[PDB]
RNA sequence: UUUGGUGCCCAUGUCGCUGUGGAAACACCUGGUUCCAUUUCGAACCCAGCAGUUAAGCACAGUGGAGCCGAAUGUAGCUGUUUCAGUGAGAAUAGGAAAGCACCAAGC
RNA sequence: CGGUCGCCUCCUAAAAGGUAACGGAGGCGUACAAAGGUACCUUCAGUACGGUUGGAAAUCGUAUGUAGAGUGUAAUGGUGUAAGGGUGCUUGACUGUGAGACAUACAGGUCGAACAGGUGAGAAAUCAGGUCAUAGUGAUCCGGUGGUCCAGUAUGGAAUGG
RNA sequence: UGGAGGUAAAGCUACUGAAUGUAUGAUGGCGCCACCUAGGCGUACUGAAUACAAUUAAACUCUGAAUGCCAUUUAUUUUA
């Protein structure tokens, strides 16, 4: 990506000067955006889950691996050995493609993007964005599952302190309230 | 009057398996002799000592048996068969 | 009637009272204590009798601690029953008191009342009691 | 990994008002698909 | 969860334990450790706990990290073993998958008379 | 007692040389293993025999 | 002697905090076109190279915070004979403790 | 009269082993073509934080946590790079044996180095004669089934046996 | 002299149960309000978790003997 080179150049200079970091790679660098489209209807309407997977494929370019629960609950009809939920973890070139595509096309199409920040970091530097609906993503045809869902896009960073992670988001211009 | 008496419900016990150490430290031993019968490895195997389908330690060569305490906080026991090592 | 809420085994082996003093040997909550001089089995009924007696002769500001507790139960075969057919059913709970264990302690009321209070507590118990004070 | 039926191809995206032809890899039609609300066409990102 | 070097040590601990349990004829153990830049080699003996033979890229003075130089390193260590009159050896990796550079080094030892 | 045992017989000399166990309720398909044969003195396929 | 690798050991070897370091090496790192790989991701494994790097890891100095170890005296249980001679714990405590023993390759 | 009768685990059982009572608690008369064999890779439960449906608790990411997780099962013992989880290839859940031992009144039981044949995994070293280990079992007689280099009541067969 | 063990004893911040007091306190009961659902201020009181001090156990153990048991070394004795 040309903006990937832009990422290299821009993040280096500004971050380096903002805290006098003694090495250029001391500045934080983002590693992987995990996507987790999991649904419990696969216990009963298994067919539904299959269609789900294809949409995840169509959004990222990586086929989603379906995850299995580590316990069993009767109230949720859950039992061990079943696959309920797919997770995808993008790295290298593809994750930055998805990140830019999210912030510029998918994200500002959100029905009411008022945004949410400062109250999302987990205390170790991560960040989760809870999307409400899937239809807003461009890579999905009108024909879909009879049920509509959201997303659980999350973020990670090399640093463990939340303030420098916030600094990376501001340097990347991730559009949230005051952050 | 006898008044009658109740009935007991637990009077069953199994044969006592004769586990424990068989060959003591310092004892001469030939190959193929059992050194320790156990339920679960209470004494680890070392050099010249084998294992069976019942976690029974048996020798693999001639020599003198020797127990050595090892492991975290010296809580694990290990057995070995120090060969004769006569070496003229 | 002091009683454990639940126990793992209904019928345990009895616990011996011969020997020295294991724990509860020195006054450490109050400053006067009723020490024992003869190991014996004393049940929760005697605790309640002694505790109610002491409490009645206590005042409005005195405070008390109960050290011993009847952890172990004891059985009794029903009357007119011949030997055999298993162990009896648990009947009453007893605390094991060894020679030297401090059973009751008192504080926060003048000196004369506590000696009398400990006296009536010890007259309710079979063990031969004796008064001790707390080390400075 | 590779050998996939869904190819990640660099598709360009146009928008109204501001053209802003962003080229992003996606598995869609190989042409200038126009988006109606982009990043620059949002009151939150730019414009108080 | 860790870094590659720690994982290689963990796998290396697994292999060393297995060999010490089953090596009954007391052969010398040819442990090769591969790094990002170079690969070195040393032949220990777990009965005496010393090293009988050694070889390395630093000793052989090459810009290593390639499959070509792995054959020469393997050749050097095998030459030392024949002079030492030991040919029955056991070959274990430092905890890395046996492939590529590791395979060239292992194969190089085999054509000059080593037995493993 | 229950009878979960089953027989594995050679397919060359048609000799039964092994005794194993099999669950008819869980596993429905006939075993087609390959084991040593005393007669043929080699490894050969052994199938279930009534 | 120092660095790097490894075996023996299995906290007086740990967890953590504060600083210093790289010549060679150790490492992050640069890319996936080759061998190889992801229950999906060149993250890992595997390649071919050292541009950048001392945050890490790693190695040194300090740090008695957590964890660990723990003397002598005395005591409980034991063996005998005594109603006293040995044997001597656990707990608690002063306190120690920032690992140690060998082999190899390089500048020394 | 009621209860029990065989085998396995713990305590009583007094720190080798053994030790009874109509003493105190429980189980078994199995399960797995993978839960076996091998090569490679990999490591808890829970809790804290952050996140649509989704809720105290489904799944995800990070951190913490030294076993409270798993190891088909009743307990005991063992085991956190293991004996737990996943994948690939396979059937050693082999044939003929078996020095030496444990424990035993006998009958029986338990472990097993090593040899020959032909295989499976693996680069190879090595491992594999069923499973983390201990319950899952019944003598003799009689008859039935398959194979067979033995017999076949004068001889050749057959019957009938071995 | 070497070794196996887990009893007596001791300990329960080293687990499993049982369990006392003090302090901070989840929790409920109890109210009084507002609100019909999100809740709030005190609780005659119940009591999670943590800290301090103290306890109990054949089927509890982070520990932990003596005696006894096995073998070997030396001396002596008996042909069992
Ligand atoms: Mg038993
Ligand atoms: Mg540094
Ligand atoms: Mg009857
Ligand atoms: Mg005894
Ligand atoms: Mg015993
Ligand atoms: Mg169990
Ligand atoms: Mg497998
Ligand atoms: Mg298994
Ligand atoms: Mg008959
Ligand atoms: Mg005839
Ligand atoms: Mg005739
Ligand atoms: Mg005791
Ligand atoms: Mg306790
Ligand atoms: Zn626009
Ligand atoms: Zn055949």
From Swiss-Prot, chain A:
Origin, by domain of life? Bacteria
PROSITE patterns, per database record: RIBOSOMAL_L5
Q: Which GO terms describe its biological process?
A: translation
Query: Where in the chain are disulfide-linked cysteines found?
Result: none
Q: Does the keyword RNA-binding apply?
A: yes
The protein in question is named Large ribosomal subunit protein uL5
- Keywords annotated in UniProt: Ribonucleoprotein, Ribosomal protein, RNA-binding, rRNA-binding, tRNA-binding
What family does this belong to? Belongs to the universal ribosomal protein uL5 family.
Its assembly, as annotated, is: Part of the 50S ribosomal subunit; part of the 5S rRNA/L5/L18/L25 subcomplex. Contacts the 5S rRNA and the P site tRNA. Forms a bridge to the 30S subunit in the 70S ribosome.
Instruction: Check the record and name the SUPFAM superfamilies matching this protein.
Output: RL5-like
InterPro entries per the UniProt record, alphabetical:
Ribosomal_uL5 (IPR002132), Ribosomal_uL5_bac-type (IPR020930), Ribosomal_uL5_C (IPR031309), Ribosomal_uL5_CS (IPR020929), Ribosomal_uL5_dom_sf (IPR022803), Ribosomal_uL5_N (IPR031310)
What would be one Gene Ontology cellular-component term for the protein?
A: ribosome
Q: Does the keyword tRNA-binding apply?
A: yes
User: NCBIfam families in the record, alphabetically?
Assistant: PRK00010.1
Coiled coil spans: none
Q: Name one GO molecular function term.
A: structural constituent of ribosome
Q: What does this protein do?
A: This is one of the proteins that bind and probably mediate the attachment of the 5S RNA into the large ribosomal subunit, where it forms part of the central protuberance. In the 70S ribosome it contacts protein S13 of the 30S subunit (bridge B1b), connecting the 2 subunits; this bridge is implicated in subunit movement. Contacts the P site tRNA; the 5S rRNA and some of its associated proteins might help stabilize positioning of ribosome-bound tRNAs.
Swiss-Prot record, chain C:
**Do you know which InterPro entries this protein is assigned to?**
Ribosomal_uL16, Ribosomal_uL16_bact-type, Ribosomal_uL16_CS, Ribosomal_uL16_dom, Ribosomal_uL16_sf
**Any Pfam family hit:** Ribosomal_L16
Q: Which GO terms describe its biological process?
A: translation
Q: Which GO terms describe its cellular component?
A: cytosolic large ribosomal subunit
Query: Record's CDD domains?
Result: Ribosomal_L16_L10e
> Keywords of this protein's UniProt record, alphabetized?
Ribonucleoprotein, Ribosomal protein, RNA-binding, rRNA-binding, tRNA-binding
Give this protein's Gene Ontology molecular function annotations.
Answer: rRNA binding; structural constituent of ribosome; tRNA binding
Instruction: Describe its partners and assembly state.
Output: Part of the 50S ribosomal subunit.
The UniProt entry's sequence similarity note says: Belongs to the universal ribosomal protein uL16 family.
Function of the protein:
Binds 23S rRNA and is also seen to make contacts with the A and possibly P site tRNAs.
The name under which this protein is listed is Large ribosomal subunit protein uL16
Swiss-Prot record, chain D:
TM region positions: none
Assembly description:
Part of the 50S ribosomal subunit.
Please give the family membership noted in the entry.
Belongs to the bacterial ribosomal protein bL31 family. Type A subfamily.
Function statement: Binds the 23S rRNA.
**Name of this chain's protein:** Large ribosomal subunit protein bL31
Query: Which species does the entry assign this protein to?
Result: Mycoplasma pneumoniae (strain ATCC 29342 / M129 / Subtype 1)
User: Which gene carries the instructions for this protein?
Assistant: rpmE
Of the intact sequence, the residues represented are: 2 to 49 of 97
Swiss-Prot record, chain E:
Which Pfam families does the entry mention? Ribosomal_L18p
SUPFAM superfamilies, per database record: Translational machinery components
UniProtKB keywords: Ribonucleoprotein, Ribosomal protein, RNA-binding, rRNA-binding
Q: GO cellular-component terms in the record?
A: cytosolic large ribosomal subunit
- Name the GO terms of the biological process aspect: translation
Which superkingdom heads the taxonomic lineage of this protein's source? Bacteria
Purpose = This is one of the proteins that bind and probably mediate the attachment of the 5S RNA into the large ribosomal subunit, where it forms part of the central protuberance.
PANTHER family listed in its UniProt record: 39S RIBOSOMAL PROTEIN L18, MITOCHONDRIAL, LARGE RIBOSOMAL SUBUNIT PROTEIN UL18M
Q: Which family does it belong to?
A: Belongs to the universal ribosomal protein uL18 family.
Q: Name it.
A: Large ribosomal subunit protein uL18
Organism expressing this protein natively: Mycoplasma pneumoniae (strain ATCC 29342 / M129 / Subtype 1)
What gene is this protein a product of?
A: rplR
């Amino acid at each position: 990506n040309n903006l990937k080179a832009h990422y290299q150049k821009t993040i280096a200079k500004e971050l380096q000067k903002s805290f006098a970091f003694s090495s250029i790679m001391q500045v934080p660098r983002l590693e992987k955006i995990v996507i987790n489209m999991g649904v419990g209807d696969a216990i009963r309407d298994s067919k539904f889950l299959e269609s789900a997977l294809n949409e995840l494929h169509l959004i990222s370019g990586q086929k989603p691996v379906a995850t299995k629960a580590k316990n069993a609950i009767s109230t949720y009809k859950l039992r061990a050995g079943q696959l309920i939920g797919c997770k995808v973890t993008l790295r290298g070139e593809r994750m930055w493609a998805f990140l830019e595509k999210l912030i510029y096309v998918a994200l500002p199409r959100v029905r009411d993007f008022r945004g949410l920040s400062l109250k999302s970091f987990d205390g170790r530097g991560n960040y989760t964005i809870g999307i409400k609906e899937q239809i807003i993503f461009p890579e999905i045809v009108y024909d879909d599952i009879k049920r509509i869902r959201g997303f659980d896009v999350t973020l990670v960073t090399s640093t463990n302190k939340d303030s420098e992670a916030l600094a990376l988001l501001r340097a990347l211009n991730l559009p949230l309230v005051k952050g | 009057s006898k008044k009658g008496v109740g009935s007991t419900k637990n009077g069953r016990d199994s044969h006592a398996k004769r586990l424990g150490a068989k060959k003591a430290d310092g004892q001469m031993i030939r190959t193929g002799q059992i050194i320790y019968r156990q339920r679960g490895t209470r004494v680890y195997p070392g050099v010249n000592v084998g294992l069976g389908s019942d976690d029974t330690l048996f020798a693999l060569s001639d020599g003198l048996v020797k127990y050595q305490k090892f492991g975290p906080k010296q809580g694990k026991t290990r057995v070995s068969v120090v060969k004769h090592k006569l070496d003229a | 009637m002091l009683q454990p809420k639940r126990t793992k085994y209904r019928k345990p082996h009895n616990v011996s009272y011969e020997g020295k003093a294991k724990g509860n040997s020195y006054v450490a909550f109050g400053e006067y204590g009723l020490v024992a001089t003869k190991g014996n089995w004393i049940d929760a009924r005697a605790i309640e009798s002694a505790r109610i007696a002491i409490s009645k002769c206590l005042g409005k500001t005195g405070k008390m601690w109960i050290r011993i507790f009847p952890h172990m139960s004891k059985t009794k075969k029903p009357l007119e029953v011949r030997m055999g057919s298993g162990k009896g059913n648990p009947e009453f709970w007893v605390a094991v008191v060894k020679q030297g264990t401090v059973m009751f302690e008192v504080a926060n009321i003048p000196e004369s009342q506590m000696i009398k209070a400990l006296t009536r507590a010890g007259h309710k118990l079979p063990v031969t009691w004796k008064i001790l004070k707390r080390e400075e | 990994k590779k050998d996939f039926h869904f190819p990640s191809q660099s598709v360009s995206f146009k928008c109204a008002s501001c053209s802003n032809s962003f080229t992003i890899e996606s598995t869609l039609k190989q042409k200038e698909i126009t988006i109606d609300i982009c990043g620059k066409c949002h009151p939150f990102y730019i414009g108080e | 969860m860790k870094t590659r070097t720690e994982q290689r040590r963990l796998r290396h601990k697994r292999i060393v334990k297995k060999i010490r349990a089953t090596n009954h004829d007391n052969r010398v153990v040819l442990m090769v450790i591969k790094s990002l830049n170079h690969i070195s080699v040393q032949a220990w003996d777990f009965s005496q706990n010393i090293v009988l033979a050694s070889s390395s890229s630093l000793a052989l003075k090459l810009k290593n990290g390639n499959k070509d130089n792995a054959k020469l390193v393997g050749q050097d260590i095998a030459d030392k073993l024949v002079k030492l009159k030991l040919t029955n050896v056991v070959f274990d990796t430092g905890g890395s998958k046996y492939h590529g550079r590791i395979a060239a080094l292992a194969e190089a030892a085999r054509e000059r008379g080593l037995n493993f | 007692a229950v009878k979960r045992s089953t027989r594995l017989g050679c397919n060359d000399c048609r000799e039964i040389n092994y005794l194993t166990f099999k669950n008819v309720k869980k596993n429905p398909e006939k075993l087609a293993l390959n084991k040593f044969c005393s007669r043929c003195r080699k490894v050969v396929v052994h199938k279930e025999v009534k």
